[PDB]
Structures are given as C-alpha cells and as structure tokens.
Structure 1
Amino acid sequence: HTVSPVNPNAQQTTKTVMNWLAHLPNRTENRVLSGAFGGYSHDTFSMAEADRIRSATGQSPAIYGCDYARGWLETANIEDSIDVSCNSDLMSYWKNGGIPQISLHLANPAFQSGHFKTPITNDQYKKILDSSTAEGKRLNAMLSKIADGLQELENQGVPVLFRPLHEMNGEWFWWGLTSYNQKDNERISLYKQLYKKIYHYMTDTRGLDHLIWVYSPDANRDFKTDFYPGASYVDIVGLDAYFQDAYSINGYDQLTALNKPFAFTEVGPQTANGSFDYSLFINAIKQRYPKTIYFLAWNDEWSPAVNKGASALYHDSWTLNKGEIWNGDSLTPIVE
C-alpha cells in the first residue's frame, strides 16, 4: 500500500520519505532511525552532538533536530525569539544522508515576549487564537518568521519532520494544560484550534509542502490522545519519554491505535547522566514498542554519548543511521 502525507500537495520527495518511513516496521532489521537533538538555533545548535555520537559509535544519527524558538528570552519584538540559522546545517544533513527535524519552544504571545512556561487562562488562549488582538498578532508574527525559515528548506526540496506544540498534555508549556493531569475540556478544544491554525497557516497560507507533521504528547502525563487534532492533520504520532525504566513507558498502545506511524519523538534519562543504559532502550523497543520508526534522543546530559549503551543502541540490527536510508540516490527498498 501507499501511505500519503496528510498534505495532498506534498512534494514528491516528502511523499516518498513518508511512505518509506511508514513501512519500516515490516522489515526484520534496519527499521528504527536513530536521532539526536542538535540544539536551539543561535543558542546551542551546532554539529557537536552529531560529532559526539560519531566519536562514540562510528555512526551519525539518521535524524538531526533543531529548535527555532528560544521562548525563554525576553526580546524587543516577540518574533526575535525565532532564529532559523540552523537551516544551513539541516540542508547539509539531508544532502549527506539524514533527515532534519524541527521543534518550537514558542514564546508566549499572551505576553510582550518570552514566558514560554508561564501558564495562561482559557480567556488569554482565546485572545491568542484571535488574529485581531494584540496577542493574536504576536502569534502570527512568530508563525510568519517560522514559515520564512521553513520556506528556505522547501526551496531545496528538503523534507522536514515538523513537531509543533509538543507535550501539550503537560502543564509546563503555555499551550498545554494548566494543572497537573487535570482535564480541561475547553483547553483541549483550544489546543486543537491552535494546532489547526498552525497547520492551516503553514500548509495552505504559505504553501509549505515539505512538512511531515508530528504529534507528540508527554509519556508521563494523562490525556495522550485527547489532544489529537485528527487524522487529516497528523502524519506521525509519538511519545516524548524521559524515564529510568525503558520497559514501563505508557502510551504506546493508545497512540498506535490511532493508525499512524509511531516514534519516540524525544527520549532521555529522567535522573542525572552516567548510569542510564541505552542498550535497554533499544531492547525495550524490540520487545515492547516494535512499531517504533525512530527515536530522537536529547543532547546534553541526556545524550547516549554521555550515558551507557551508545554502541549497542547505534549498532543494533534494527537501527538505521545517517546514510543508511539510501542505496545511492534512491531510498532502500520498501518491504510490504
């Protein structure tokens, strides 16, 4: 069968990549892409994390992440929190055998700037969704700058795993819940409106046809599927999972039941680096989470390079690394 991007007008390369990703779990090996966060653009983003991984394992992550939005910064104009300078490295990463991933630590447009983890009321959230308000104009200014950056990658036909508004069932980011594991039906509705607003702006208003859309609740909070905006707006579902016990992560059954490819969209140890063993994570994928198509481990103290088991993680028969998705200039054969 053919699995199509939810954007019917997706570029051919993006169509090909999405279909290829969806078929990975049919294989007997070479079926989970490795991934690493590279950092926040013009703050911590660099090739240093990829280099640490290559030093540790001889291989580079198949997926490399950048985050455009430095939402903790107070700035003269809120959109100054957006920086897209990591694009050059992302485009090179695609040219050299990997796939870029972009997330957004969005500044909070209920405020003049910054405040990304300052919670807001439903009344404030409604103002943000209203393009006529001061708050709504701030959101749109951020979206426009983000789209400008994404457009640079689209010009070169570079497919992007785009993962906006993540961990929305968590109580830390402004776009998520306001209290720990507290259901708020209005907040859920407003989140879906916000996701669709971003989807519509990027896909339709700006015609961005190189995006694969990733929905990523937190593994350690309830309501993992309640926030799902719908099958027509999401390509890949996944868990952001920070844990000690790889075998006890919640949410895999709930998300795979949505009949979308599944990934560990973020992964890392919950407690201080050094002792956590990534060998247990890849084994847990094989035993508990076999539909996993990729993992994206965080950098800094969460990196496999500063924990145990990087070699086992990267050299497992199931793992696919940078360059290994290709047979020359075509992707490796799909298995049905």
Structure 2
Amino acid sequence: QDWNISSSPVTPSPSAGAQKLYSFLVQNFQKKIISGAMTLQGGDESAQTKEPDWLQQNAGHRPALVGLDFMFQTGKGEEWYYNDSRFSKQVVNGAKSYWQKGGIPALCWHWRDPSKDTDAFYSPSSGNSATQFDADQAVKSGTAENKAILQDLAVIADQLQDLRDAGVAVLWRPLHEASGKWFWWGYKGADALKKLWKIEFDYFVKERNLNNLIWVFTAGTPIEGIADWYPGDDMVDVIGMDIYATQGDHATQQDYFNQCKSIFKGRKIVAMSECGSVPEPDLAAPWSFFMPWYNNYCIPEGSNPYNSLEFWKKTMSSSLVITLDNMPGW
C-alpha cells in the first residue's frame, strides 16, 4: 500500500511555526529518524534538561526533540507547582528554550483527576492509587465532570497560548495510551475517548485559536481494536506508539510500525512517542521520532541498561538520526 500523507496539518491556518514543524516531519519521514528524550517535570530546576545534557556530553549531541508534561499544572494539592513562579512556567519555558535552539518540544499531560477529589490520573483498573473520575460524564454538557474538564483545559490552553504568542509550535499528545484503560480518559472505552478528544480539539483549535499544535494520537500499546478509538483523520497529525520492550532490547518494532501504516491507511506519519530501549535506527521501520522515558530509561544504569552509553554514541552519530545539530532553526 502507498503512503498518503497530507502536506498540511489538520489545524486550519496553522501558525508559521506549526507549518514549518509539520513540513519538517513530512519531509524527513521515511528518510531519517528524529532523536528525542523525555524530561521530568516537578520541583527540580536542574533536572529540566538532564537527559538532553547527558546526551550532549556523552554522545556528542543533544536530541532534536525534548519531552515535557503538564502533569503538575493542575490538580489536587499541586499548588506548590502551579502557584510557584519557579515552576508555574516550567513547561512553557522548557518548550520555548528548546524551540529557540531549533529543537522540537513534544508535550503531553498526565491529567490529574479534574474533580480534585484525588490527585490521581490512574484509573480503577490500573493497579495503582486511582481516581473515580468518569469520562462518560465528562463529555456530557452541564455535568460537574464537564465543568471540571473545561476548567482544566482553560489552564492548559493558557500555557499553550503563551507558546503560540511566542511563535513556538509543539507536538501535542493528549489523552495518551487511552486503549490501555489505565488512565481515567480511556477507562470508559473508545466512545468517551473520542468525545473527549473532540471537546479538547474544538476548544483548543476553534475557541482558543491555538493554531500552533501538531496533534499526536497514541495508538497503543495495546494496539488491538485501536481503529475504534481513532478520533479521525481531521483531528490527528501523527500516530504515536508507546512500546516498552524488554529492558535492553533494541528491536526495531517493525511489526508495530507496519500495523500503524495499515490501520491508518498510510495517511499519517508514524512515530515512537514513548519507549524504553530505543528501536535501532533502520529505514525499514523508520519511526518519525523516538522518545525514551526519563531517568534510567534514558541515562544508563546497571549492567543491562535500557540505552547504554555505547548504544547512544552509535545512535547519535548515525547518518539516519537527526540530532539538535542537524536542525535548520525555525
């Protein structure tokens, strides 16, 4: 089957920066693989560029993409973060800083219980301390849950608007890993997930005129039955997989790449939006970008590290891999 990717993103009248970022992704997709790393948000200012800095010093280059998370921007008991000047702009500033260097900010949001009854994003089937927040109620106009999600969406939109007004575009990967049902937003299944996606897409893109976002739908794991979870081609720019292989296994994950091509009819760029061990760079499974998780998933620890020093040196010097030093500047 042929690829059939749009040269423009789904946002009408995308910002100049979003145009440039999307075009960069389309032009490099299938020819090069964009390096990435997640960082840990919270009360540690030094940590904010830990993983990229380690990569610069150890492997000779910063990743082209940096991962940031709004998880503390809202939530029960999170005032220490969102009301402290040291942290309330941590995500915006990290994204601005990386964009200004020519890199790609990739934002997500482990969205804490919008009711504020708990501080949890994990669902009752996750095995972890959970929220009871009901996605099916959140998508119905005029419920308490609907009011709550719209309050939180306004806060995050304010942050994204700060980025928009600074000329920054981002990969935006909301409502991620929905099909695992371990987060409240996927816990009620595909119907609520798609209705949530639409509420957020319309609020951000139409109501708030956030035209600076490249929308990433996380398709698994688990991937089985993901077609029924898909928000549609008009609400998604990139298909991302979150695949955590055995620790130390750099298999390319070819089969998942192929499934994403098939399931979505070749219409969207396919990326490895989270991983542990990074898939070996390989143009037979040419993930648009990869992003290991933070701490030991990136910086090696122990005798069987997720991504060894040797692996990183090789990867960051590969002609297949785009590092921050290969970026054109926005």
Q: Shorter chain as normaliser: what TM range? A: 0.7 to 0.9
Paired residue secondary structure (2:180): coil
Gaps of 5+ in 1: 179-186, 270-277, 331-336
CA contact (8 A) 1:102 1:163 kept: yes
Work out which of the residue numbers 207, 210, 214 in structure 2 matches 1:212.
Answer: 214
Aligned residue number for residue 289 of structure 2? 294
Distance 1:72 1:210 in 2: 22
CA contact (8 A) 2:73 2:156 kept: no
CA contact (8 A) 1:110 1:124 kept: no
CA contact (8 A) 1:4 1:15 kept: yes
Distance 1:212 1:218 in 2: 19
Distance 1:106 1:18 in 2: 25
Paired residue secondary structure (2:11): coil
Please identify, of 145-154 and 80-89, the stretch whose mean Cα deviation from structure 2 is larger.
Answer: 80-89
Distance 2:29 2:48 in 1: 31
Paired residue secondary structure (2:69): strand
Distance 2:133 2:325 in 1: 48
Aligned residue number for residue 128 of structure 2? none
Q: How does 1:148-163 map to 2 (within 5 A)?
A: 148-163=158-173
Distance 2:292 2:67 in 1: 10
How many residue pairs are counted as aligned between the two chains?
303
Aligned residue number for residue 172 of structure 1? 182
Higher relative contact order (Cα pairs below 8 Å, separated by 6+ residues): 2
Q: Which residue identity is paired with 2:15?
A: Q
Q: Deviation per CA, 1:254-301: give whole Å up to 9, x if none.
A: 3223220110001104xxxxxxxx5xx224x434x12x2111111111
Please identify, of 246-255 and 315-324, the stretch whose mean Cα deviation from structure 2 is larger.
Answer: 246-255
Question: After TM superposition, what 4+ stretches of structure 1 lie above 6 angstroms from structure 2?
Answer: 120-123
Paired residue secondary structure (1:232): coil
Please identify, of 241-250 and 139-148, the stretch whose mean Cα deviation from structure 2 is larger.
Answer: 241-250
Gaps of 5+ in 2: 126-130, 302-306
Q: Which residue identity is paired with 1:243?
A: A
Q: How does 1:292-331 map to 2 (within 5 A)?
A: 292-306=287-301, 307-308=307-308, 309-326=311-328, 329=329
Shift in Å, 1:126: 2.4
Distance 1:76 1:37 in 2: 21
Shift in Å, 1:19: 1.8
Q: Which has the higher strand share?
A: 1
Distance 1:123 1:312 in 2: 45
CA contact (8 A) 2:41 2:90 kept: no
What TM-score, normalized to structure 2? 0.83
Work out which of the residue numbers 224, 229, 232 in structure 2 matches 1:230.
Answer: 232
Shift in Å, 1:133: 2.1
Paired residue secondary structure (2:53): helix
Question: Closer, same or farther in 2 for the Cα pair 1:296/1:305, shift >3 Å?
Answer: same
Distance 2:89 2:214 in 1: 18
Distance 1:6 1:205 in 2: 16
CA contact (8 A) 2:274 2:291 kept: yes
CA contact (8 A) 1:159 1:210 kept: yes
Shift in Å, 1:2: 6.4
Distance 2:20 2:116 in 1: 41
CA contact (8 A) 2:33 2:290 kept: yes
Please identify, of 249-258 and 12-21, the stretch whose mean Cα deviation from structure 2 is larger.
Answer: 249-258
Shift in Å, 1:26: 5.2
Question: Closer, same or farther in 2 for the Cα pair 1:122/1:250, shift >3 Å?
Answer: farther
Percent of aligned pairs with the same amino acid: 28
